Amino acid sequence: TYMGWWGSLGSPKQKYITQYTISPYAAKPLKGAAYNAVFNTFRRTKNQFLYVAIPFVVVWSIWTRARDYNEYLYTKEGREELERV
Amino acid sequence: ATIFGGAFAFQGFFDVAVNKWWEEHNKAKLWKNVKGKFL
Amino acid sequence: MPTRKSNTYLSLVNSYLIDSPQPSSINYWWNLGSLLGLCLVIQIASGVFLAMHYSSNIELAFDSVEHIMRDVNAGWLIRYIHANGASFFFICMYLHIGKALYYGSYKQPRVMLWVIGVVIFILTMAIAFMGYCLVYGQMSHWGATVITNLLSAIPFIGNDIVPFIWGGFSVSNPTIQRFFALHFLLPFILAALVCMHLMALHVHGSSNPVGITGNIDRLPMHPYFIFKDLITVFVFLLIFSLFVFYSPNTLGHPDNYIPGNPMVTPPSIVPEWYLLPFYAILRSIPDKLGGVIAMFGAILILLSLPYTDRSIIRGNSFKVLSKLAFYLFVFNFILLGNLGQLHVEVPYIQLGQFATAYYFAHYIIVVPVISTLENILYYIGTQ
Amino acid sequence: AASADVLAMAKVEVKLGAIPEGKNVIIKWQGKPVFIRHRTADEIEEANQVDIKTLRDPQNDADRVKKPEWLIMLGICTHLGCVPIGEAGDFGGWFCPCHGSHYDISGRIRKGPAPLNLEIPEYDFTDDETLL
Amino acid sequence: NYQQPDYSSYLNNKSGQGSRNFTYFMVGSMGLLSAAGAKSTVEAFLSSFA
Amino acid sequence: SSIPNSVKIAAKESATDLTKLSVIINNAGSKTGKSGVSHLLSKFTFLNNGAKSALRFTRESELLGGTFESKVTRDALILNTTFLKQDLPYYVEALGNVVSNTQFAPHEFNEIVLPTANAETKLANANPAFKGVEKLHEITFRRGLGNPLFYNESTPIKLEEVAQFSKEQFSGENISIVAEGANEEDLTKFVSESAFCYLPSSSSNGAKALPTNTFTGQEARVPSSGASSALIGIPVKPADFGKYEVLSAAIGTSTLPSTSTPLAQIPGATSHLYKYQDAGLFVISVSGEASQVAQGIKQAKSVAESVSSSALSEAVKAAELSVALQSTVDSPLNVKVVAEEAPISKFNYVAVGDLDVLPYADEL
Amino acid sequence: ADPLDTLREECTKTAACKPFDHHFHECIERVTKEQEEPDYEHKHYKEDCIEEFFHLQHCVNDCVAPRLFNRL
Amino acid sequence: KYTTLSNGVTVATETNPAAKTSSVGLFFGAGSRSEHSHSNGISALTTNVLASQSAKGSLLTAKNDREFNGIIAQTTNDNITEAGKLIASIASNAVDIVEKTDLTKHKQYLSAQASAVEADPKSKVLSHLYSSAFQGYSLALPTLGTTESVENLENQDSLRHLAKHLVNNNTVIAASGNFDHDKLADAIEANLKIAEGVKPEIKPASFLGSEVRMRDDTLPKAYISIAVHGEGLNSPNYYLAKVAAAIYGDFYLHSTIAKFTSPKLASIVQEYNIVESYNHYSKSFSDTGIWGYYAEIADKFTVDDFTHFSLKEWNRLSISISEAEVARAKAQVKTALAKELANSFAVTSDIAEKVLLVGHRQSLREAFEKIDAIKVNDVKEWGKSKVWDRDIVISGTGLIEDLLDYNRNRNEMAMM
Amino acid sequence: VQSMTSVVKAANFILARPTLSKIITPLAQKFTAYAGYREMGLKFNDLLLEETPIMQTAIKRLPSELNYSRNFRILTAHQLALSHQLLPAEKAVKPEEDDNYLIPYILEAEKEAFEKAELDNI
Amino acid sequence: MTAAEHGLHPPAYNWPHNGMFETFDHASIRRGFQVYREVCAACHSLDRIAWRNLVGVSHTTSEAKAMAEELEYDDEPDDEGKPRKRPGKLADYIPGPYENEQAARAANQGAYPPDLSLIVKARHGGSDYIFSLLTGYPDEPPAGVVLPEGSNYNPYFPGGAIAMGRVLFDDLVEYEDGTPATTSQMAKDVSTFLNWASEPEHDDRKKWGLKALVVLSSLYLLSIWVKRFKWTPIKNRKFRFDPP
Numbered sequence A: 001t002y003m004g005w006w007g008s009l010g011s012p013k014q015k016y017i018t019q020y021t022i023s024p025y026a027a028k029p030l031k032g033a034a035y036n037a038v039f040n041t042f043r044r045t046k047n048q049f050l051y052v053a054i055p056f057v058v059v060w061s062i063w064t065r066a067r068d069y070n071e072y073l074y075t076k077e078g079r080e081e082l083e084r085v
Numbered sequence B: 001a002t003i004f005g006g007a008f009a010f011q012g013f014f015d016v017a018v019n020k021w022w023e024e025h026n027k028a029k030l031w032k033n034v035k036g037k038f039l
Numbered sequence C: 001m002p003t004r005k006s007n008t009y010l011s012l013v014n015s016y017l018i019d020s021p022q023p024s025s026i027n028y029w030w031n032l033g034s035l036l037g038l039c040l041v042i043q044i045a046s047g048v049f050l051a052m053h054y055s056s057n058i059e060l061a062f063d064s065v066e067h068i069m070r071d072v073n074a075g076w077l078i079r080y081i082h083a084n085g086a087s088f089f090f091i092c093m094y095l096h097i098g099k100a101l102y103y104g105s106y107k108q109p110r111v112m113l114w115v116i117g118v119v120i121f122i123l124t125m126a127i128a129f130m131g132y133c134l135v136y137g138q139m140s141h142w143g144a145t146v147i148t149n150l151l152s153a154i155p156f157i158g159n160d161i162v163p164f165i166w167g168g169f170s171v172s173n174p175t176i177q178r179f180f181a182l183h184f185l186l187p188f189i190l191a192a193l194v195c196m197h198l199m200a201l202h203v204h205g206s207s208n209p210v211g212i213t214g215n216i217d218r219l220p221m222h223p224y225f226i227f228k229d230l231i232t233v234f235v236f237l238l239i240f241s242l243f244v245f246y247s248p249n250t251l252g253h254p255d256n257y258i259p260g261n262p263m264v265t266p267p268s269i270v271p272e273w274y275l276l277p278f279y280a281i282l283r284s285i286p287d288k289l290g291g292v293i294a295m296f297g298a299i300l301i302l303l304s305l306p307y308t309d310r311s312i313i314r315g316n317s318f319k320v321l322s323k324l325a326f327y328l329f330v331f332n333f334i335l336l337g338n339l340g341q342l343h344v345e346v347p348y349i350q351l352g353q354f355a356t357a358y359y360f361a362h363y364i365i366v367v368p369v370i371s372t373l374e375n376i377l378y379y380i381g382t383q
Numbered sequence D: 001a002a003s004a005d006v007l008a009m010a011k012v013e014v015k016l017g018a019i020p021e022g023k024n025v026i027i028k029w030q031g032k033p034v035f036i037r038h039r040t041a042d043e044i045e046e047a048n049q050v051d052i053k054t055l056r057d058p059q060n061d062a063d064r065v066k067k068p069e070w071l072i073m074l075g076i077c078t079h080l081g082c083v084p085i086g087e088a089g090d091f092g093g094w095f096c097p098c099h100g101s102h103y104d105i106s107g108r109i110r111k112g113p114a115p116l117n118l119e120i121p122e123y124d125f126t127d128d129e130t131l132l
Numbered sequence E: 001n002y003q004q005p006d007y008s009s010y011l012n013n014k015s016g017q018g019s020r021n022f023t024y025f026m027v028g029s030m031g032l033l034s035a036a037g038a039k040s041t042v043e044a045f046l047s048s049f050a
Numbered sequence F: 001s002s003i004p005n006s007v008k009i010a011a012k013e014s015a016t017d018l019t020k021l022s023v024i025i026n027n028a029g030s031k032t033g034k035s036g037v038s039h040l041l042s043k044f045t046f047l048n049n050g051a052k053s054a055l056r057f058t059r060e061s062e063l064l065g066g067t068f069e070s071k072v073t074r075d076a077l078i079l080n081t082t083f084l085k086q087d088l089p090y091y092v093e094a095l096g097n098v099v100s101n102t103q104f105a106p107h108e109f110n111e112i113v114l115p116t117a118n119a120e121t122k123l124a125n126a127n128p129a130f131k132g133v134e135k136l137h138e139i140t141f142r143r144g145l146g147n148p149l150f151y152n153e154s155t156p157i158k159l160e161e162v163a164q165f166s167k168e169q170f171s172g173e174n175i176s177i178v179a180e181g182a183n184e185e186d187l188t189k190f191v192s193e194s195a196f197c198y199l200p201s202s203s204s205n206g207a208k209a210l211p212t213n214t215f216t217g218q219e220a221r222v223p224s225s226g227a228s229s230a231l232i233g234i235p236v237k238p239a240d241f242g243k244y245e246v247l248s249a250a251i252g253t254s255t256l257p258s259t260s261t262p263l264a265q266i267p268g269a270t271s272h273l274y275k276y277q278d279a280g281l282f283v284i285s286v287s288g289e290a291s292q293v294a295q296g297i298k299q300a301k302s303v304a305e306s307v308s309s310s311a312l313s314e315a316v317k318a319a320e321l322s323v324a325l326q327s328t329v330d331s332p333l334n335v336k337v338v339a340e341e342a343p344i345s346k347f348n349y350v351a352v353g354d355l356d357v358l359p360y361a362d363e364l
Numbered sequence G: 001a002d003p004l005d006t007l008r009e010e011c012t013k014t015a016a017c018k019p020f021d022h023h024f025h026e027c028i029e030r031v032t033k034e035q036e037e038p039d040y041e042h043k044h045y046k047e048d049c050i051e052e053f054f055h056l057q058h059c060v061n062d063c064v065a066p067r068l069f070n071r072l
Numbered sequence H: 001k002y003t004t005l006s007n008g009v010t011v012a013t014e015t016n017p018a019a020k021t022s023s024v025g026l027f028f029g030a031g032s033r034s035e036h037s038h039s040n041g042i043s044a045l046t047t048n049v050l051a052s053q054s055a056k057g058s059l060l061t062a063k064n065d066r067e068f069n070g071i072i073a074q075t076t077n078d079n080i081t082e083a084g085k086l087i088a089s090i091a092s093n094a095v096d097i098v099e100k101t102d103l104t105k106h107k108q109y110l111s112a113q114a115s116a117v118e119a120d121p122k123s124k125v126l127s128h129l130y131s132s133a134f135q136g137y138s139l140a141l142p143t144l145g146t147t148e149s150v151e152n153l154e155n156q157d158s159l160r161h162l163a164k165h166l167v168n169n170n171t172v173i174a175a176s177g178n179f180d181h182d183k184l185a186d187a188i189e190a191n192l193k194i195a196e197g198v199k200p201e202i203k204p205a206s207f208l209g210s211e212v213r214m215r216d217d218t219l220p221k222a223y224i225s226i227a228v229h230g231e232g233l234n235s236p237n238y239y240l241a242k243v244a245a246a247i248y249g250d251f252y253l254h255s256t257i258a259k260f261t262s263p264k265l266a267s268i269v270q271e272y273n274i275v276e277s278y279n280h281y282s283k284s285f286s287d288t289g290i291w292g293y294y295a296e297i298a299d300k301f302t303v304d305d306f307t308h309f310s311l312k313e314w315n316r317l318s319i320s321i322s323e324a325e326v327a328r329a330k331a332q333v334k335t336a337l338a339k340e341l342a343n344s345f346a347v348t349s350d351i352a353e354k355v356l357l358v359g360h361r362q363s364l365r366e367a368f369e370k371i372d373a374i375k376v377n378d379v380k381e382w383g384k385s386k387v388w389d390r391d392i393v394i395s396g397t398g399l400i401e402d403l404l405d406y407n408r409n410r411n412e413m414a415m416m
Numbered sequence I: 001v002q003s004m005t006s007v008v009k010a011a012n013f014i015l016a017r018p019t020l021s022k023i024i025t026p027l028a029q030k031f032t033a034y035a036g037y038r039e040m041g042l043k044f045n046d047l048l049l050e051e052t053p054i055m056q057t058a059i060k061r062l063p064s065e066l067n068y069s070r071n072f073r074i075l076t077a078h079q080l081a082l083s084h085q086l087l088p089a090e091k092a093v094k095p096e097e098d099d100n101y102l103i104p105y106i107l108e109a110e111k112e113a114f115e116k117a118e119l120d121n122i
Numbered sequence J: 001m002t003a004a005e006h007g008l009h010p011p012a013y014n015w016p017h018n019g020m021f022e023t024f025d026h027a028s029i030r031r032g033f034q035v036y037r038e039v040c041a042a043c044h045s046l047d048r049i050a051w052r053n054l055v056g057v058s059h060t061t062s063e064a065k066a067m068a069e070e071l072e073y074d075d076e077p078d079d080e081g082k083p084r085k086r087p088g089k090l091a092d093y094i095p096g097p098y099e100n101e102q103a104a105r106a107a108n109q110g111a112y113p114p115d116l117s118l119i120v121k122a123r124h125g126g127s128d129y130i131f132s133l134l135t136g137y138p139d140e141p142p143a144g145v146v147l148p149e150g151s152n153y154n155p156y157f158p159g160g161a162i163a164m165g166r167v168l169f170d171d172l173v174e175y176e177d178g179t180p181a182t183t184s185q186m187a188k189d190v191s192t193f194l195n196w197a198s199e200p201e202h203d204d205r206k207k208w209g210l211k212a213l214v215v216l217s218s219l220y221l222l223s224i225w226v227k228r229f230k231w232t233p234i235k236n237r238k239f240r241f242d243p244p
Ligand code: HEC
Pocket: J035, J036, J039, J040, J041, J042, J043, J044, J108, J111, J112, J113, J114, J116, J119, J130, J157, J158, J161, J162, J163, J164, J167, J190, J194
């Protein structure tokens, strides 16, 4: 397998890396929750926006065109074109 | 355990708070408050 | 050793919940699985409390449901749960498939896992559909009728299998009774499939939003991702309450509250919302056999996906073009779902045909082509 | 499979005489919806003239109707069951309302997403009476 | 050994045994709210048996 | 003092109000039996008596706060104990039941002794300096004092051998009880009324001490991984213990860890005069990287010789300090440190580690 | 008088609803003209003002809805 | 016995006629705790330079402790007075000796020592634990400095350190052995000549629960250490902290008594041979301490099991410790104290440490009386106050993949 | 999955021809900069799908220094994803440090595997 | 479909019971039940509502019981086998005006007035639709449309032709509490009553929902805090990599 238990997780020989941390009960919980949830969330949305917007814009443009055409077809002026289809 | 008993404290607290706020927000609409007019 | 490891039962519970070495970089999306499991409980739990009052006879199914709503003490709550909770079960399942499609959770070391995933999906849909047929409203009855008529398109056995499904010559008492029995049952088969899913997950562990190996930094699960599971669970339950208690019939269709009458077809036939996409695909293909084959392919092609994905890098988080392709695919899937509920009209027939075409083209062209292009682009750029 | 209880009722019955020269009276037949109609003189003639070759479906009115004026059609408008609407479609005979497909006076899958002719419900008729 | 990262800003301002007491308070409140919700749900379901 | 068994008792006041009682089996060390018997015997000492089992005696001792160990030395087998002054009547009695009627059960030989002895041997030999010293004793005193100090699987020993070595040893003439911080009269009474009174005066069928037979001019090489070590060993008569203690302290001795000494100026170098009843071995060792040791041992050799007699005399007081430090309760030392010159030309040499780098005796 | 009729009367007189009422009334006039010809029964496409009526009623409902139940 | 000489320096001696050897040393406080990151290790370098001087037959050695430093001249009893003069000279000419010194060689020696404490796994683990526990304060610094900071020290730095810390108010002459105290005091008074100055303010330090993980997968074992804020030399719980530590005592798997040691943890970890060895300790500084254990686990898959069981046994400290365990711990702590105070070198170091850091040294008999006053309820009160549910500081060196991150071990501190 | 042998085959197919090189390489660098992995400290080869026997062999045959640097970069990337923060521009991996360090070892692994497959079908 | 086929979309009236925390106006439920019995009982069944369902909602138990005796119900036939009938009781369901769908179709030109016990949950617009339907009849059908004989034009009905025909007219009912009986008032009252009949759990459902939201929102905030707190050690990790 590619993931053993804790003793041997399959990680390569790791060495020279020192991991420091502080306890809870001794750290400010939600240290920057308010400021981060705004600024960093905006940064993440800015980075990831185009990937969701360009496909969304394309698909929703297609959908809007189809919906408007369908609405136009079923009207006293769209009767003829509806018959031709 | 004390979990069983303690759950009653919170359940009763929220239940009474809501069953006292609801019949105050809606007192003009409930039955028990309107029945007098039609009796 | 600690009791949580010495005892075999607690040893299993530990291996899966308390010490499962989850990667440290998993988003909230990895919580969806737990929710799905939670939902599987809820569907079962409320479900077991509806069968205690539901009478499967065709002349009693709808009246029995209304007895649950009106007469049983909390029957309205149990029914609204069992229904909106199925809708949420499929919301979470679609999110769990979307996550597995965005991040390469379907790639090599977990292909087996992915397969069970797909099977679960397939099985679930059946269950949901079958359960819906139990209400025996207008939309319930006519959905059963349309489904069986489409399955009547198998080349040779089609004419013979349908009576075995109907248990007669049309959707009637035997059909509803067998649907109730198999619907009570298949959820436990799905629980077994979920156990197999968890085994295939535990063999190789879970992936990362970064895609790279997590073995270098893995965290236990009891203080970490169990309390993240609680955030996700409570958000799920909060939205589930906003639906169950307020506007519980939003996801359903009003026509389902008209008792089933074979002699009058309702104006439109649509499945419950979560099956709309595939239904749309079914209508995009004119041939009935073609339609059913295309639909079941729309579900099964997830199996082909791990092999068509020629990407050397797991996941989309670091891939420009593949992210665009993925979001375009997701929005086309939503477009298919939308077209499922819309009448077969002048623009919508062509739009649905194109949407189905692109839905399959995703797996069989776009994923391989884009993955290969991005592999070449990565290598050329670094050099 | 069909419990013997369901197979009983495979053949129903009908009072053919009461229905009008111009009316359609749906009844349930073979434990299923059926469209039962008596042909109008103009409609019967119009069908005789219509070419079977013209229709994509390979069926003819003469084979579809056992007794000339009185003929039996199964209720599902489309190959996959579509509740049958009345007097709509390519010829103005029926509408496969489930998909809005067009069903002809023949009952064949004329237009829409239709596949095959509305099955003449296999049947026999006695005087002003019918069986199906 | 070496210079640790400065956590000054991350450190809490509250007492050593007090913050854990408050953590106990909210964890127990969560547990007992969950117990009350489970009691309500289980009672509602079992009331169907009646 | 003595009792009818001829068991010598020595007792003298102590600074830190601990009765550091100790028993010195005169010739039950690693020199007497076949290679490694004394190690296993030392591992059997405190386990199961005829009076209290291991799990009872150890628990009681820990309650009483005392410590106990059994260390093997080439001359004698030492059973050290250390306890508060109130605790003498207990431990002394226990020690009696250790020398007499020790059980030697096979399940201890297989579960607690052989595993422990092997672990101790492996841990000690992992140190290249100690392996080199063992080899130096082997090649300098071919038998007796050169026997390996610890049990080695190369010389299998069966439980019967250890049991028969406990018997035929441990005799009254062969054990010397030494205490620090215990009244000699009270200790004499406790010993007389303990199990020590039942030991035979002398072993009937063993303890035929052999002559020392010091050999010089030899050399050896013991390939080993990791750290290397080169050692030089001068066999010395007991009457010369004074000359070399002054020499060692003059150049640098393990007992006196201090910079500014000529031998401390080179990395990893040290010296020490191992002292035994009938012979001694002055060892100058260097340890560390093989390339470093190659030059270090030659520098140490050049330092040991060519030590100014004036500086040697100056080192007399340091040597007296070192002797005072070494003279613990278990290892009583009586050496008169004189500044008389000490030769080195008769040296044995042993190399351990990267034998491709370490020099041969011909390079000194 | 019931509040609903007076609300419809007020809304249809609003500027936003005026163009829809206009279009609907000339649609009525045009359809009556079409009904005047003797060949009306034979026309395949017999116009009707359903769509204009729906537009007018939607634009009037969007105004009456929020205000009506304040009257009851 | 105490005598404050001229210059205000105090000579404290513990003379015993049974002493095998005599020792006398000058200690001037201000160890690593008095340094800062840039000039860390300067105290050790200065003490090494002073201790490298001509010994005139004695044995001159450096101390280099965390909070105090000094030079000790071991020597046989009759020579003690000479050694006295020696160290006095070495300290009256400390600035001259430093100025005339080529710090190169002494700096490679100190760098070798600093590498040694960073190679011996226990030394590395404990140094890292102390650094992380008191991170942000001078007490976190190594006693011997780091290899990066040692090479950056110059003579002027050592001169400034001596001028600041080698003052009468901050120095003590400690002695032990078999000699007349008055003779040694008179000999030192005639020869000791050091600058005046106020005792330097001892820098603050505050415990901070933290975790440091130097995972080196190439090592053969996992050397971990876990501790809580202990008791400093001033706290009246000092001996109580030692008793609490001894309740769990030491353990070496391959030792013969491994199957018979009293502590419950020893019996627990031998069922599957969870750990190779461990030792509980209560390190005490001037005003703060570290109370915990060090452990070496051979099987890399059982680090979590050992931590779980050890912290559960700590939980027992506040609830279920029996009078048997308390009595055993009291006896063992008394014996350990008496063992630590046998060698004259150790007695001199202890006298210097206590007199410098607490001002008064409790005789061994007073310490025994204070320990014997401990009841089981006192130990359980101490466990509630200082061990039960208190933040822990953790350290690990190799094969620590199985050492679950902080929250697991921290939560183990309060589960029943 | 696509083999590094085939990826490099295609890349050298493109790079050899000046027109395709000029058109693509600027786009290749632009795509690799927009990929955003460098902002998390990862080099390209850190992203490679490790869970394959060929790739596992490739890592298992890395030098010591490269192996430890890869471990640290992967750990840093995990921490950055965990804390939802990115490396500042000055600390990010520069284009010149994305040196394709692991590609040669993967290519050697694939060469060995391809020779074994070819000879098994000799 | 055409706008006519789908039926004009009913607007959103601000019903007293729309918001998340408002109940039905039980005064309106009683008035709507009055309008029901007075008008709708001529044609519509409303079977799934039993008199017992009205106790504590719009009628005191005595009133519901009395209304029960006012009607006749079929009981178990006497021991002699002859049919027997009994005065109604609370447990009895409200009776429709027709014995079977055949009778209803016969008496309404073939149109079948649907049972109203689910008409609010069985229509797109819900309550609004019913209201818009009852007051959506224009005095003059839009020009050009021809209705089948017997049908009346209602734009909100799919297809535009409904067999009902306007029923609610001004002052058609004298309300018990003196409320004016404008057609709009009657339509609102009937729509509210039918919405209750289709959703008798509405008040209980929304109260339980409020309690559940309070509990789950507090618990979700607590979970957020606990997770951020227990993850502070991980999000505060700092690494070093110092090779030679
Ligand atoms: C006399 C006959 C009545 C009376 C007094 C009422 N209704 Fe209505 N109803 C009636 C007919 C003939 C029909 C046929 C409907 C059709 O042609 O499709 C109906 C139908 C309804 C509906 C169905 C609306 C729909 O399906 O879109 C509803 C809703 C309804 N009826 C309700 C209703 C209410 C609230 C009344 C209040 C007095 C009422 N009806 C009176 C015939 C009649």
